[PDB]
């Protein structure tokens, strides 16, 4: 009854960040240090705990949120950060209890001529609240003129595509990200270490 982390980390396709995927993980055994004992992860930063302790701790639930961003935006997947991703796409709380894991996926998510299938929200009226997901597709009214669902002057389509080409600079190459949040309710804990 090992936690199905291979389903999330070793998934063929990843979600666009604006529609980030969330998988619940419950009633399982979580040997965390299969990860972290992996040099494949260019980012592995835990905030509420440190992961070698997590094989000794139990949680009610663990949420795995997965998506794809570009390199220089990995810094935004952290509490108290600003930028397009942190403000409009995926927001972590300041009291974040969990881990952020990320790796370079240039060989999978880039294509000759450019992969344009991964999207991010470029415009929004307000910032997201922590763990809020906005998959709306309303034309963004930048000026005083209503848009009536038609993109044009001062009326922007809210989602933009990443331009992932293999020869992009590392800051513009795709990165796959999994955010594990550890939910402790006043109910029986269901996920644990060995």
């Amino acid at each position, epitope marked *: 009854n090992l936690c199905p982390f291979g389903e999330v980390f070793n998934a063929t396709r990843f979600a666009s960040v604006y529609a980030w995927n969330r998988k619940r993980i419950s009633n399982c055994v979580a040997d965390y240090s299969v990860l972290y004992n992996s040099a494949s992860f260019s980012t592995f930063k835990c905030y509420g705990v440190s992961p070698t302790k997590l094989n000794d701790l139990c949680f009610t639930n663990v949420y795995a949120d997965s998506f794809v961003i570009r390199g220089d935006e990995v810094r935004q997947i952290a509490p108290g950060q600003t930028g397009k991703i942190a403000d409009y796409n995926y927001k972590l709380p300041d009291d974040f209890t969990g881990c952020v894991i990320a790796w370079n996926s240039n060989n999978l998510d880039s294509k000759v001529g450019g992969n344009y299938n991964y*999207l991010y929200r470029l415009f929004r009226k307000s910032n997201l609240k922590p763990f809020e997901r906005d998959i709306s597709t309303e034309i963004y009214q930048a000026g005083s003129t209503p848009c009536n669902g*038609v993109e044009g002057f001062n009326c922007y389509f809210p989602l933009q595509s990443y331009g992932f080409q293999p020869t992009n600079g590392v800051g513009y190459q795709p990165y796959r990200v999994v955010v594990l949040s550890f939910e402790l309710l006043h109910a029986p804990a269901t996920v644990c270490g060995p």
Partner: antibody
Amino acid sequence: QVQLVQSGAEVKKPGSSVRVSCKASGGTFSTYPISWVRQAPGQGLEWMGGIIPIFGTAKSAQKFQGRVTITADEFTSTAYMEMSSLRSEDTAMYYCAREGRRYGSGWYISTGYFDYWGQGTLVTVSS
Amino acid sequence: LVLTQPASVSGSPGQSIIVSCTGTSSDVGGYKFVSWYQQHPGKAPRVMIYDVSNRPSGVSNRFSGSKSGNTASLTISGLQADDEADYYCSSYTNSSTVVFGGGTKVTVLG
């Protein structure tokens, strides 16, 4: 650098079905409306229908409903037009046409503003 | 439904000509979504005007568009031999479809 490249011309027997493809390159595919427009030899343009891939929404002219299917493969950046029970009056040049702008969800499929076109595919219905 | 265009319009070099396109209140007269396309032989159409009078970048300012009632018009100024082509109007409809006009062949005389 958006480019629409369509599949090659062909002949099809009456009553059979045809699939025309149009691969989009060099830009976003899922968020832009794509339309199919046909032109009989020496005749005028006629809009067949359109699709917005990310919304999964489509619309065809009534004369083409039940006979024409317009689909999209977002992973290969490719739009498709399929026509069944081909008649000789279906002999035409079939064009892929991307909308020059995008629309919000719940609004239009196409308002008739086409920026990029495919090179066209000649379908000849004959025995 | 076919929007009504003149079959033929002719002018001399430097002359200004007008291609009309008449629909109904359920299409041309119901929306601002009228476009104008130029098609040379053996080529795909190319949008010259959209939303009645907006001109895309790269289109010469000799082309302009207008609309009143159920009739839209494409005015071509400073007629040149390379303007010789088929011109089609397009319109949104109250059925949420797009319909084209029958086309107008523009020829430069003289």
